[PDB]
Amino acid sequence: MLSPSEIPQRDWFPSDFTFGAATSAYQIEGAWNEDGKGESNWDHFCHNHPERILDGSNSDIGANSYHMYKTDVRLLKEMGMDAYRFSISWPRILPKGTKEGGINPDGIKYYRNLINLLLENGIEPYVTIFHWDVPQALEEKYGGFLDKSHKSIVEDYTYFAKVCFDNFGDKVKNWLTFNDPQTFTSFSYGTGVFAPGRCSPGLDCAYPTGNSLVEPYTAGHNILLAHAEAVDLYNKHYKRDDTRIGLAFDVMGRVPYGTSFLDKQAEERSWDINLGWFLEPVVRGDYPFSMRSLARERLPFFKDEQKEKLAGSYNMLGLNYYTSRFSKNIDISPNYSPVLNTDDAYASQEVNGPDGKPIGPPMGNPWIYMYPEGLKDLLMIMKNKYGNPPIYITENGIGDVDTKETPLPMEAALNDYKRLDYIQRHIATLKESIDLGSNVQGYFAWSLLDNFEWFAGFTERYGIVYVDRNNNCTRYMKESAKWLKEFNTA
Amino acid sequence: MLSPSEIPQRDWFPSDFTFGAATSAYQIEGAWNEDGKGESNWDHFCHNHPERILDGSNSDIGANSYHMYKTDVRLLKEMGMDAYRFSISWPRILPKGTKEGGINPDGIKYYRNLINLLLENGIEPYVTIFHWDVPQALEEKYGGFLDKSHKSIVEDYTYFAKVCFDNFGDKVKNWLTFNDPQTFTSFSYGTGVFAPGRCSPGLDCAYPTGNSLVEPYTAGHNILLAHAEAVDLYNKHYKRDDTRIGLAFDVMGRVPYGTSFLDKQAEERSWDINLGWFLEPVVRGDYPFSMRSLARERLPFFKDEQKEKLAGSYNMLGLNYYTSRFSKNIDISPNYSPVLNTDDAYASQEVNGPDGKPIGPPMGNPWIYMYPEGLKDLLMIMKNKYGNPPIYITENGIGDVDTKETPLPMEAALNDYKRLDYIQRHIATLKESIDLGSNVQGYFAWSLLDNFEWFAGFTERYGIVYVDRNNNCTRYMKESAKWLKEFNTA
Ligand SMILES: OC[C@@H]1[C@@H](O)[C@H](O)[C@@H](O)c2nnnn21
Ligand SMILES: OC[C@@H]1[C@@H](O)[C@H](O)[C@@H](O)c2nnnn21
Ligand SMILES: OC[C@@H]1[C@@H](O)[C@H](O)[C@@H](O)c2nnnn21
Numbered sequence: 001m002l003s004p005s006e007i008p009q010r011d012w013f014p015s016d017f018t019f020g021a022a023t024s025a026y027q028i029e030g031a032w033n034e035d036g037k038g039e040s041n042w043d044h045f046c047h048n049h050p051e052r053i054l055d056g057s058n059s060d061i062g063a064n065s066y067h068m069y070k071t072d073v074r075l076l077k078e079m080g081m082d083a084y085r086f087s088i089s090w091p092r093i094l095p096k097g098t099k100e101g102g103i104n105p106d107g108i109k110y111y112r113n114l115i116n117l118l119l120e121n122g123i124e125p126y127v128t129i130f131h132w133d134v135p136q137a138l139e140e141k142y143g144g145f146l147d148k149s150h151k152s153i154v155e156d157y158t159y160f161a162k163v164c165f166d167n168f169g170d171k172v173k174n175w176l177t178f179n180d181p182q183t184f185t186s187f188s189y190g191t192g193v194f195a196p197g198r199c200s201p202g203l204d205c206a207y208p209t210g211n212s213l214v215e216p217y218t219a220g221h222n223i224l225l226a227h228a229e230a231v232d233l234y235n236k237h238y239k240r241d242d243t244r245i246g247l248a249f250d251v252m253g254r255v256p257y258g259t260s261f262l263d264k265q266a267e268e269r270s271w272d273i274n275l276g277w278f279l280e281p282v283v284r285g286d287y288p289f290s291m292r293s294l295a296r297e298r299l300p301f302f303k304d305e306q307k308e309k310l311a312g313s314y315n316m317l318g319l320n321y322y323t324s325r326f327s328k329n330i331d332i333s334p335n336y337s338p339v340l341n342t343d344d345a346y347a348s349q350e351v352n353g354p355d356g357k358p359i360g361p362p363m364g365n366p367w368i369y370m371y372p373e374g375l376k377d378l379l380m381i382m383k384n385k386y387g388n389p390p391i392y393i394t395e396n397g398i399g400d401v402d403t404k405e406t407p408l409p410m411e412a413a414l415n416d417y418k419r420l421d422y423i424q425r426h427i428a429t430l431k432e433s434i435d436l437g438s439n440v441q442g443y444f445a446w447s448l449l450d451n452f453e454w455f456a457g458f459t460e461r462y463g464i465v466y467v468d469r470n471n472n473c474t475r476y477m478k479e480s481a482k483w484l485k486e487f488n489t490a
Numbered sequence: 491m492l493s494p495s496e497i498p499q500r501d502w503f504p505s506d507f508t509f510g511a512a513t514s515a516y517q518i519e520g521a522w523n524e525d526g527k528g529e530s531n532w533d534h535f536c537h538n539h540p541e542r543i544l545d546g547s548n549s550d551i552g553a554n555s556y557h558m559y560k561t562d563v564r565l566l567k568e569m570g571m572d573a574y575r576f577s578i579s580w581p582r583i584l585p586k587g588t589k590e591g592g593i594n595p596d597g598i599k600y601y602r603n604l605i606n607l608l609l610e611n612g613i614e615p616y617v618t619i620f621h622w623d624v625p626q627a628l629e630e631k632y633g634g635f636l637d638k639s640h641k642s643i644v645e646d647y648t649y650f651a652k653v654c655f656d657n658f659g660d661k662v663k664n665w666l667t668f669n670d671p672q673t674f675t676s677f678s679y680g681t682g683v684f685a686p687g688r689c690s691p692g693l694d695c696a697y698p699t700g701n702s703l704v705e706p707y708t709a710g711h712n713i714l715l716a717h718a719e720a721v722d723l724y725n726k727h728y729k730r731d732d733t734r735i736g737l738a739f740d741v742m743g744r745v746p747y748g749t750s751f752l753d754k755q756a757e758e759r760s761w762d763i764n765l766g767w768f769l770e771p772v773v774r775g776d777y778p779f780s781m782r783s784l785a786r787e788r789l790p791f792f793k794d795e796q797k798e799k800l801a802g803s804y805n806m807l808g809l810n811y812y813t814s815r816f817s818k819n820i821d822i823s824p825n826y827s828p829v830l831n832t833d834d835a836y837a838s839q840e841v842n843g844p845d846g847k848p849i850g851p852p853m854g855n856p857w858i859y860m861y862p863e864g865l866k867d868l869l870m871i872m873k874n875k876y877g878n879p880p881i882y883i884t885e886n887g888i889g890d891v892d893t894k895e896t897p898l899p900m901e902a903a904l905n906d907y908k909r910l911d912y913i914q915r916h917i918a919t920l921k922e923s924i925d926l927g928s929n930v931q932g933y934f935a936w937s938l939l940d941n942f943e944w945f946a947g948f949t950e951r952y953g954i955v956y957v958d959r960n961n962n963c964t965r966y967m968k969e970s971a972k973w974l975k976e977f978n979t980a
């Protein structure tokens with residue numbers, strides 16, 4: 001519903017600016033036990049706990065992109081995308097997760113063929129090493145990223161990254177070590193809505209025998225140690241002058257709930273716990289002060305050698321931006337006690353401001369509210385506080401609800417003008433942000449394809465391309481994809 | 491040192507703006523054991539521990555203002571001062587510190603006569619109820635402001651305030667319950683340089699059997715409870731349309747040491763622990779979040795009733811401003827624990843910036859560096875963050891060093907061009923601050939009179955009027971005083 005002169009055009013942006021789409025391995029690949037692939041944490045969680053997926057489903061098939069990857073590339077090419085963000089399945093490459101367990105050559109051939117095909121079609125691969133799919137072998141051996149020794153997972157992740165660099169590094173110039181460390185740790189070990197489904201006693205998850213105040217910080221610490229080890233390896237033995245490594249953060253914009261200075265403080269604590277938790281370690285080598293003061297002993301300390309490896313451990317940064325929240329102060333008092341790790345921010349995160357209105361229009365699912373102004377706020381924080389590094393918006397989109405009780409007619413799914421409007425408004429925000437001096441360099445639509453949306457199952461469709469599961473995952477371009485084609489190829 | 495067009499003029503300010511000078515009872519009065527007056531904490535400290543005073547002195551005589559108050563008023567009148575800020579000696583009024591012990595009629599009569607003399611000369615009294623002189627009887631009974639009951643000291647202070655309102659309130663329209671709660675608690679119970687001289691075991695004070703991490707907060711909590719109760723009493727039974735009550739805070743300006751956001755965070759924590767510690771309770775009903783997060787259990791909680799009495803418990807506020815520091819970050823770490831309560835800010839306070847130069851030129855004594863910009867910064871914080879309430883600069887001045895090893899010749903002491911330049915520059919800053927929207931309404935030069943400068947004894951002269959103690963405490967106007975007379979009466 002933007003007027004014609006407000007619709008973004010490709011020539012608003014630099015010639016070397018990048019437009020792409022994004023997927024992740026567990027969400028699209030299927031072929032969960034084919035050609036030597038080992039079980040993952042998510043295979044295990046979905047198979048043993050279908051009650052913890054909203055529609056009882058799994059990603060045994062997904063979008064069948066293991067078998068249908070060629071048509072994925074054709075879609076990207078037809079839309080004139082500059083790049084494709086996808087992830088590598090750790091267990092597909094290393095079925096037992098370790099060096100000892102062996103490299104799976106069919107796993108390697110799959111990603112090799114995908115990468116070469118993208119490149120022969122003029123499409124740049126942006127490769128996520130880890131997008132939440134831990135080999136179940138490692139989960140059973142030492143709990144994966146829960147590894148209390150801060151050694152085994154770091155070595156096993158580092159070797160995995162090495163295998164990717166050896167086998168794909170000659171063709172891949174853009175790596176991201178981790179995707180959404182914050183969501184992964186908080187949801188897997190805090191609320192337990194993600195595999196393996198752990199949380200404190202008294203809380204509603206599959207395994208209420210963890211600790212929602214400690215385990216998320218343990219896993220987060222292991223993620224940062226792993227990231228720093230992998231980047232140290234990459235810089236020393238793999239990086240060339242035109243290649244880049246980083247990681248991608250999930251981030252909601254934060255706006256103070258009211259005019260009180262207390263809500264400004266709340267807002268700052270909220271940026272810190274969401275983004276700062278992982279950003280500040282890679283920028284300066286330690287967690288934010290606020291988190292140290294509030295989580296205290298539950299947040300591990302780094303060795304000085306590890307801080308050195310952490311500080312400056314990126315050439316670029318990914319931001320996965322979807323929505324924003326109002327941050328409202330909570331005082332420290334004997335009547336409040338944190339239950340979840342995210343409660344350490346002493347701030348409630350509200351959809352509705354003091355007027356009772358949502359921060360922006362609802363996009364249809366339980367959590368996405370359209371607030372492009374938050375993207376601008378975030379890019380200005382990256383510019384003015386964190387050194388203005390090269391930024392890619394590695395995910396941005398909405399999920400159309402499609403359930404057994406309230407089906408989404410294919411016709412309505414394809415006429416996705418709500419998604420299109422949302423994409424247009426966020427892209428236009430990026431131009432406004434560039435004009436203000438943001439070092440943002442690209443934008444990736446989250447979801448080339450309708451796919452398995454984690455604990456939501458297939459109840460939400462995020463694709464710019466529809467996937468008919470009743471057929472054989474046949475792909476049809478939605479209106480959003482048709483505009484992106486027009487946009488890129490004018 | 492200011493050029494002619496830069497020297498402030500009286501018509502730079504509104505016609506109802508207030509220029510004055512300031513003293514305190516223990517510092518000027520003398521007559522320490524006369525006319526029924528009870529012993530105070532400072533009598534006890536100086537007499538029993540002369541080794542803790544730099545020149546071994548006491549204020550048995552002070553500037554002899556108990557006997558010489560008439561010439562104090564004559565001096566104020568000659569200078570055209572609109573107002574005089576002085577304090578009431580708790581033990582001069584209530585020798586045992588309680589209702590039980592009785593009111594001392596000669597004490598009442600003294601302050602009655604001073605107040606009446608000031609008013610018939612057209613000088614408005616600004617009366618500080620407590621400027622650090624606790625009746626020693628209360629110190630011996632329950633530790634004074636250390637009272638772990640949070641009850642006895644509150645009742646005794648509130649009764650003291652009631653006696654002041656009952657006996658002087660018909661003539662006094664401007665009351666300050668407390669002077670420098672931060673300095674008083676930190677120096678009395680943290681570093682122990684002030685009476686009664688308490689600090690943690692291992693530290694250099696007269697009685698290293700306290701707790702520098704706890705006692706200052708206990709004392710601070712009792713001060714705030716006493717303030718709230720006295721103001722509640724005042725509002726209910728004594729306040730009129732044209733009268734006002736508040737308190738006065740010591741505050742150094744804070745500037746980030748470097749360009750790093752970490753030093754901006756350190757700067758904020760420093761404002762919080764210096765100013766916010768006592769300001770935020772009277773503004774909103776609780777301590778700053780940063781202090782609760784860092785001091786934790788060492789900082790007591792308020793009852794809901796107490797929070798309600800505290801919030802908005804002022805019609806005006808005093809700021810005692812002399813200097814500023816650079817605030818430099820200190821990370822939370824296993825290799826650092828606070829020793830003094832002020833270490834809870836996790837910031838070092840530096841005189842010299844990263845270029846090795848001082849924040850501003852030294853004024854002569856150990857701690858005062860001239861930085862009038864810091865006053866403007868402080869006034870903008872009061873304006874923008876804390877509601878822009880009516881503000882009086884209730885102290886501003888410098889101390890001229892005068893010692894047995896390096897005497898200050900009387901002529902050099904009277905030609906106090908360094909003091910005059912400092913006073914002129916800060917009054918100029920107030921003009922600039924008012925145009926920027928500050929609700930500042932007056933300025934009081936600290937020290938009508940050369941007086942007893944606490945642990946420094948008589949080694950520092952802060953007067954605009956010189957006091958010759960080798961004669962009969964005879965007063966001579968310095969050049970600062972002469973310029974102020976010209977400024978006020980031109
Ligand atoms: O999968 C659920 C999604 C995550 O993908 C996002 O990272 C997260 O910010 C969010 N908030 N609520 N639900 N979610
Ligand atoms: O929830 C929608 C998408 C998920 O599908 C992605 O896997 C995840 O990386 C992400 N983070 N923020 N929101 N998302
Ligand atoms: O004596 C030292 C002086 C005290 O006497 C002042 O009253 C106090 O506010 C201050 N802070 N820094 N140094 N001091």
Ligand SMILES: OC[C@@H]1[C@@H](O)[C@H](O)[C@@H](O)c2nnnn21
Pocket residue numbers: 514669670673740810812885936943952
């Ligand atoms: O140290 C100089 C003066 C003391 O003489 C005053 O008693 C005190 O109220 C104050 N606070 N700030 N600086 N000072």
